[PDB]
Structures are given as C-alpha cells and as structure tokens.
Symmetry: D5
Subunit: 140 residues, 10 copies
C-alpha cells in the first residue's frame, strides 16, 4: 500500500466499483464545491504525479471505455503542460494504452463530469490543467 | 434464519414490503455509489450464490410480476461466460416454481438506473462478472 | 386518548393541520421505502381496524374534499376478498356522516405515489391484503 | 417470528449477546428517562404478557446466573395485588424448566438503577402496576 | 380537545412519555433554563406565566402520591425579602387536583434547587416575571 | 422586545433580510408540513393579533411591494365575518401608513405554495376566521 | 493575514478554487436565506469596504472573466445615492489593473439567484443599500 | 440593539438566566478548547472594550454576588501593563454603581476552570494581554 | 489483502497504531454493547479462524508485550476441548515465532472490561468453544 | 503559509490559543484512538521534520513554560537510534533561542495520556520510531 494514501482514501478506492470515477484535482481546482456531493480527501502537500502513481498501484483503469483517464482542455487563448506526459508515463507503467488512454473535456464539460465523481482528491499540484479524472475498471 | 445474515440485514428484509427491491451486488459492482440513497450492507467475504440462498429462505419473490429477479446483460462484445446465472436459476427454482423463467434482464446502464431505486444494496465479494441480481419482494399472504 | 397511540404518534397527530395526510399501511405495504421522507411509526402488533378506530377518535376527516379517506384498488386479475373495506367504512361512519361515501380509491401504483406525500406512515401488522388507507385531516 | 415484534426490535434481539439485558417496562415506568442511554422501542398498545410471550420465543434466558429474570418489588406499604407475577412465571416456565425459580426481584429504586444498564427498554402499555421485568440473555 | 390549547405538540409528547418519578421544571423568566436543561428537553413557553402553565399541566399530569411533597419551590436567598404571592397561586392550582394542596409543596435552597433541576426530564422555559416562581413537579401513577 | 418572542424567534427576525417572508399560521394550518424546509416556531398558546403586534415592533414591512402582508382568500361560498382582518389592518396601521392597503390575498392553494417559500412559520393557536398571514420584510434605512 | 477574518472564513477562502464565488452581503441582504445551501459567516460588526479590503489581500480576482466582481443594480425608480460603489472600485483597483471595469452588475432578483450559487455568503453590517458584492476567485 | 452583536449572540444573551456566565476572550485565549462544551461566538475583528460596551447595553450584571465581572490575574513574574482593566472598569461604571468594585479576579488556571463552565465564550481579537473577562448575569426585575 | 475484509475494516486496520486493540468476538459475544464506544464491524458469516488468518496478513502483533493475543478463560470446571485455541496458535505461528506463547488469557468479566477499551470489535459468527480473541497491534519498523 | 497545510489545519492552528497543545504523531502512533476527543488531521505522506518546519512558521512555542515541546522517552531496553530528535531541536532553534532546551519528555504511557488532551493530532507518515512531538502554543504579542 502506497504510504501517501490515508486510511479514508484506501477505503474509498476499495469501495469504488466498475465505472466509478475519481478526480485528482490540481491546486487551483474548486475541489470542495465540485465535490460537495462527493467524498473530498485533502492531499494539499502532494502533486498530481505522486498521487496518480499511488492510485494506479491499487486502481485498475477501465478497459470498457477507450479513454478511462480525462484531462481538462486549455481554455481557448490559454501555458506548457509537461505534467500531461508525466501522467501518460505513469499510466504506461500499468496499462499498455499509455497516452492513448487519456482523453479530454472542455473546461465546463470537465466541471460537469467532475460533479459526478465518487471522490475528489484535493492536491496541491501547482501546474495548471493538471486535473485528471480516472474511471475504475474491473478486477478479474 | 441463515447464520450469515447480520442483524441490520435481517431488519431490512423485514421492513421491505411488496414491490420493494434489493440488489445482490457482485465484487465489481459500484455498490456504494449506486446505493448512495439506499441502505448498503457489506458482505465482502461471501459469494452471490451463498447470499441468494440465504435471502430466499426469508424473502418471497414477487408473483405480481412475471420476472421478479433481474440480471445484468453482458455488454456487446464481452463474451465472458456466465455459469453463475445457472447457479442462480437453480437456487430460484428451489423456492419458486417459475425457476429460470422468473429471471429477467436489463442492459448494463439500465440495470444501474434500476439499482439506484433499490431499498438495499448488498455488497458481495462475488468474483464472477455479471453476477449482480435484483430481487423484488412479494406478498406475505 | 386511545392507549395504543405512542407518544410520537400523538405528537404527529397534533402537529398535522388541514390537508395533511397519513397512511395506515397494511402488513404487506412498503412502509419504510414509501415513507422515506415521512415520519414512519411502527405499529406492527396491531390491525388496521384497531389503528383506524384509535386515530379517528382524535383526527377529524377533511370536509373540504369529497373523499378524505382513500383505499388501494385491487390489481387487475387479483380476486382476493376485501371484507376489511366494510370494516373501515363502518368505523369511518362512527365519526363522519358520509360513511362509505367518504372513501375513494387509487390504483395500486397511483396509491404509492400519493402515499409518498404523506406526513406520516403508520406501519401496521394488518394481515388482510388491500388494507391500506390514506386519511386527510380536516379542521378542528 | 412473532408478528408483534417490529423490525428494529428484531435487530436488537439478534445483536444482543450473552449477558445483555432488556427491560419490559410497564405503562407507568419511566421508559424514556431510564432508557436515555439505551434503545427504547415503543410497544404502547401491548401488554406485558403478550410482549414476554413474543420475546421468549426468540430470546434464551441466561443459565449462567441463578435469576435471569427480575421483577420490581412492591414499595413497602403498597398492598396492590400483583396477579401478573404469576402470569410471567407461567410464561417463563413454558420456555425454561427453572420457571419461577428463574425470577428474582429488586426494590423499586434499585430496579431503576439496574434498568439504566439495559441494552434495550421496551415501553409497553401494561396497566398492571409492578409489571416491569428485566431479562438477561443466554447463550445460543 | 380535553388537552389545554397552550401545550405545544412536543410538550404533549414529553408529558405522555414521562413515567412514575420523572420530574419536570416550570422555570420562571429569570431561570437559566437552557444551561440547567442542557441534558434535558427544553420547551420554550416565553409568552406564558407560571400559573397558566401549571394549570394546563395538571389537567394531564398526575402528581406523585408516593412522596409527600411532589412539587418543589426554590427558597429565597437569605436576606432577599421579595414578595412571593405565586406560591399560594400554585398551592390553589394543586389543591384543585390533589387534596394535599399546599402540603404537597416542598422547597430547596437555591443552589440545591439548581442541582435537582439538572436531573429533570424536561425544563419548560416560561416568561413568568415573578422571582422564585420555579416549580419542580414529580409525576405519579396512572392507576 | 416583546416578552412573548422566544430567543429562537428573535434570532430569526434579526437574520431575515429584505424580501424574506414569515408566516403567522393559525391553529388549523399545517405548519410543520408547509414549513418542512423552514424554521417552525411553536406559539400554540397565542393569537394572531398578539403575535403580529409583537413582530411589528421589530419587523419593518416591505415598501418595495404594494402589499407586504398577505391573507388567504375565503372559500368561494363563505360569507363569514373576518373580524381578525380589521385587527391586523389596525396593527399594521400603527407602523405603516398604508394600513389595510398593505394587505393582499392569495387563493388557498396558492397561499400554501407561497408559504412553502417562507424563512419561518410561526405556529399560533389562533381560532379566528381566515387568520393566516404572510409578512415580507423591508429595509432598515 | 487580516485580523478581522475568523478561522472559519480563513478555511473557506483557502478551500475555494478557480471560479468559486463568495458574496459580501450588506446589512439589509437576506444572507441566511440566500445562503441556505452555502457557508454563511457572520461579520455583523463590519462594513463592506473593511471586509472587501481584507478579502482582497488573500483572494485573487478571476482573470478568465472580464467582470469577476458583481454589484446589485438599483431597482428602477430607486434613486438612492450609491457612493460605496466607488469605494469598492478603488479597493479593487489596488489589486487589479482593471479597477472599475472588473465590476459588472445584475438586476436585483437576478442577483439573489446568482448569490444562491455562492460557496460562501459573508453577512456584513454594511448600512448602505446596494452594497452587496459577488466576487469570483481566480487562479494562484 | 448594538449593531455588532450577531443574531446567534442575541439569542444567547436572551436565553441566559440569573447566574449564567459568559466569557469575553482576548485574542490569545484558547476560546475553542475552553468553550468545547459551550457556545463559541467568533468576534475576531473586535476588541474587548467594544464588545463589553455592546454587551452591557443588554446584559444586567448580577447583584447577588459582590463581583459579577472577573479578570485573569497576571502570572506571578509576568510584569506587563494592563490598561484595559481601567477601560473595563469605566464601561461597567456606566451601568453599575459598583464600577471597579464589581470586578474580581482569578489566578490563571482557576480562571480557565471557571471559563469551562460558561454558557458562551466570545472569541474577540483583543490584542491587550490579560484582557479576558467573565460576566455573570443578573435578574431582570 | 484478503477478500473477506470490508473497506471499513481495512480503514480500521490501517488507522490503528502501536498498542491499539481489536476484538474478534464469537457468535455469542455481546459485541454491540461491549463495542458501544468502538467501531463494530459485522462479520456474522465468518469464523474466528478465517478472520484471524485475514487480519494477521496485515496486522503485526505487538512485541512490546509478551502476550499480544488474549483469550477468555473457561468457566471454572469446564473441561471441554478448545480446538480453536490450537487453530489460533498455528495462525499466529505463521507470522510470529512466539506462536502459542504469544497467547494469554483473562477471566470472563475482566475480558469484557478489556474488550470495552478496544478500538474495534469484529462480530463473527464463530460457534467454537472459547473463541473470543483480543489482538494488540505492534510496530511497523 | 506553507503549502502542505490543509484548510482544516490552518483553521485549527488559528483557533488554538495560549496553552493549547497539538501532537505531531509518527506513523506508528495510535493517532485515531488517542485523538478520539480531538481533531485528527491526516498527513500520511509527510514526515515529522517537514510537518514541524511548516507548523513552526505559524505557531509560536509557549514561553510561559520552559519546555513547550515534548518527546516520547524510549521504552527501557529499546535502544533504537533517534537522530530525528536532533532534527527537531535544529528546527526549533530556528524560531526559539531555547533550541533543544525547549524539549522535554514523557515516558511512553504518560505520553499517550497527555496526547489525549491535545486539541489536534496530526497523523504523519513518519517512519522513525519515537518521532512523536507534543507542541504547546504560546502568545501572540
Ligand atoms: Na476493465
Ligand atoms: Na458488476
Ligand atoms: Na407475491
Ligand atoms: Na399493501
Ligand atoms: Na373539515
Ligand atoms: Na413502573
Ligand atoms: Na445460557
Ligand atoms: Na401516584
Ligand atoms: Na422597505
Ligand atoms: Na441588500
Ligand atoms: Na486568474
Ligand atoms: Na441582579
Ligand atoms: Na512490535
Ligand atoms: Na509512536
Ligand atoms: Na509565549
């Protein structure tokens, strides 16, 4: 069990089932309001990459959709996003799809999808557009 | 009364009335999120057959509908076998003469929508896929 | 004040006002699920007639509607006898001059729909089928 | 399973273990105050005998103590008849060969003290005075 | 309809579920009803006096005959000479239901009174403007 | 501050702002059900007049609407005297030159729907004919 | 950090993210009813200017919208002077180049509707009318 | 009613009775922990003098004790000026002829023990040290 | 991680620290009343052996005491076989060299008093003789 | 304000006053059970040094006692190295001239007893043993 996962989040990850979603929220993300109907777990001292790595050790990404990981598209007009490659690299560790497992949603569509999440993890990730929705797959 | 039923589930089964539904959720099912507005009872160490057997000893299946038991249909392109469906049919036949004919089905997403209306979701540890089962309560005459 | 009425139900009956409804649920009725947004009072050891008689001693039936008492109609093809309907009519006639004319009916699923709006559901142990009754409160 | 037992009390009876006590409270008993730290189940329309009969069908009396059933003694100088004590002894005899020898007693205020330790207090409508009974659960 | 109109539904519930020996406090306007009643049920009756509350309660609440003095007043602080005519009003209202009348009323020193009131099942917060108009009532038997 | 106002109601009256409504409900009104999403204050031993009188000492009536007080319209057949309406008009006149002109009305079922939106319902013991009253709070300048 | 901000409001301001709104409510605003589904923080002893100045030291205004601050428009016919609007624009100018141009407006009832969506309503004692202000949080 | 008092504190002051205590806590005081079993009202942007002035307009000080206001004594060895003590005396003198004589004191830990029994703790932002004040409520005759 | 452990028990096992205790209660044990101040996890369908086996995969037994597992002493004069004690000893031996030497005991009422202090009580359906077991958590080095 | 501090912990640190204590719990510490009556904030992915450094940026150590920081003494016979104690002393020295002299100690079980009185327990992931630290808050002048 990854050391950074608090007992409440371990419980959450275990009780999620096929198709449930969680959000890794970056430091700018309105995690408490979006997650008002969800379980919000604070991880303010941690970045998106280390959180994703920890989750992927125990959380299978859904194979029943082509893109079980979802990023937020940059607002038209709007910075470099190397964390997206970090995310792809981490997914590649566990899932052969790697970067092809990652889709995207326009900002407001992303918020709408995130309000449906079972759990929002409030990170301290300082990179912008570092939000990531993960959809749980099957344990076979 | 089957030894495996915890006091809370005994209370649930008793307070359910005619037409109420419960869900026997397999180990892959999103029991907590689907059951967010229902009573969720954990039974992680038990399989679907053992739970269904216990429930049927104390829970009459509805005769006011043709198919009081509902399975989740396999997603198109998913060819996994489902011998557990046959296990369930055998268990149902022991209590209800309709047997397999009392078992209907719903497309995956339709099944989720119906399960959200259940009074109670039982989170089993059943490892078989598509081992979810909705049960509708009948009358005590 | 009828001895069978528990303190909580006395409070309920007193705080209901003109137009509020209560359901006397028979033993087969889904009282807890239907009453999810209501006050559910358990009276599992009592029949419908006993409960109705007790209630009517303290609960005026609405004269601002035709039919302040409502039965559940038998489902198509169900041929079970319903002698309790005459018992209920007899009891209502002890308190309201309209007697059986104060009793209407709803199809089974429409009955459930109306019962979800009740202020209080009383879960009886009445063994007779179709022994449910919705009552609407009048003025004091 | 006796029809008069509501679902909450069935849960209570099942989750009680060896040595847990419940109180069958008569109509004059301060059930809510004594039971402030316990589960209080209302049974206002039922007598002590009816309730005891129902409980004993599902509740084994403790054989690890001499007197698993306990009555409240009459206040010195209160000469009121207590026929219900013989009714209780008869009911106990039906389920436990000890019969009346399984029944002890406590002075009024000592009875209140013991009752405050009960897991569950059942508030009956029993009109007879000194019709309270503490029952201690045995092994299954 | 035999029930006094001033009793709110919560208090009717309280009066019914009290049993033999349970106590309630009719708290005067100056009484610390919320703090004393921290572990009790507090019912607000701010617009009502002590006499009208007592009169209403006694229509539904039998006073305990297993003790000599089921009603208890607060004793005046030594040196406080304030008139207390409501004590005789309370006696008259009790006498209407219980032959003991004034003899059914005991008293407790101020701080002892607070200690006993903390044990009450319910504290009724009246608006009674008279001092020392607090009254503890102990419930009797319904035979 | 009038003595009849309990501490909770004082808090409510202070918390209310411009446009907020309260209901003075008569003895027959379904106060608890209508106010299920509001704050319900019990005043069972008190009449509509005495309650209104007390409230108006601390509650300004809205001048941004013509009729900040609302009565329930009589049942279509009913010719009964409504002396409490004149009582209410009189009490309003003490604080607001509009007096009776500040009182509007709503049909029974529309009145219930408006009452469901109130911040607070005061459950009085009023027995007078057609005594329910909605009040809308104004500005403190 | 400003002395006037209580610990609960500090937590609110930290947990808000990009796009979240708070309302600074004037003394006449229906802060509790509007904020029924929000966090309402009482600041009854403080004016609108004092509160805005404090908030802006820790709360970045959104640059992803042109007008992240919103005033309530005067009711047509209500000709009351609104000098606080200039006080607000001045305070905004200290942190944001846009100054007065960062302030939009909503008709009275539209304003109430939008305020119902706020994460937090701060209930000021501001005695001036039309002193309400909605603020939308930007990025860090 | 002084404008600085929030609705909840108005409710608190009204529901306190003869002998109940409240604490005006300075900015250094452990108001939340001391007040764990009480009602804690945040007034972080206000000083002790302004709070006391506001409270005294609606809160009578107990005449059944000699000293209804209580300060915290300086820890032996803590040489610090406490000009706010004279401020407090002045404000009390406005309402109670006893003035400075109505103010007693408790050693630090005795003070905390007494404060734990208060009905309400008001958490001020007062930066003056030893600016804590316990007030005991009197009678409304 | 053994499949029988429900999410809530996983959380419990993770949040326990050095010296914390859990009780594996048998089917006759008063788990809800003893555990009134603890977290009670229902495991009604499982035996003491399988729960212990599962727990020990994730839960180190304390080495700062000699006997981190505690059994309930038999009723005086009871000479009934206690085969589950050997089952327990074997399961402990798989993880801890002390094996049976890691197991102590308490008289029935002393055992209840200690169980009242446990962080978590697991309500099993174990019917074997003298099957209650208290476990004390060790260190992760 | 250090990035690692979550909103809830910021609120805790602000609302603590003079003499209130918090515990930085190491990964082996029974943070949830000891903190049953406190606020427990999870910081599982962070070590003791990192947390102490962040806390000391916003939390003044009490000068009204000689030793406002408290360590847990090693169990007699447990000779495990404790280099973190020097790390802690160095971090304290950055804010308080007392440095290591500001650190006292309590025997293990006495440490648990004292920690039960803390306002807040921070559950770190610190892997070193005896890395628990109790901090007592001072005044802001
Ligand atoms: Na999958
Ligand atoms: Na599934
Ligand atoms: Na049927
Ligand atoms: Na039915
Ligand atoms: Na009528
Ligand atoms: Na009795
Ligand atoms: Na036994
Ligand atoms: Na009596
Ligand atoms: Na106005
Ligand atoms: Na306004
Ligand atoms: Na921005
Ligand atoms: Na006085
Ligand atoms: Na160890
Ligand atoms: Na430790
Ligand atoms: Na200091």
């Amino acid at each position: 069990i990854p050391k950074i996962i608090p007992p409440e989040l371990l419980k959450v990850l275990c009780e999620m089932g096929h198709g449930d979603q969680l959000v890794i929220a970056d430091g700018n993300f309105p995690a408490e309001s979006i997650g008002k109907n969800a379980i919000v777990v604070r991880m303010d001292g941690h970045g998106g990459g280390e959180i994703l790595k920890a989750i992927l050790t125990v959380f299978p990404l859904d194979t029943y959709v082509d893109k079980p990981a979802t990023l937020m598209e940059k607002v038209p007009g709007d910075v470099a996003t190397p964390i997206w490659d970090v995310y792809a690299g981490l997914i590649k560790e566990h899932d052969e799809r790697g970067a092809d497992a990652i889709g995207s949603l326009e900002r407001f569509a992303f918020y709408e999808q995130a309000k449906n999440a079972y759990c929002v993890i409030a990170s301290g990730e300082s990179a912008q557009y570092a939000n990531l929705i993960l959809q749980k797959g099957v344990v076979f």
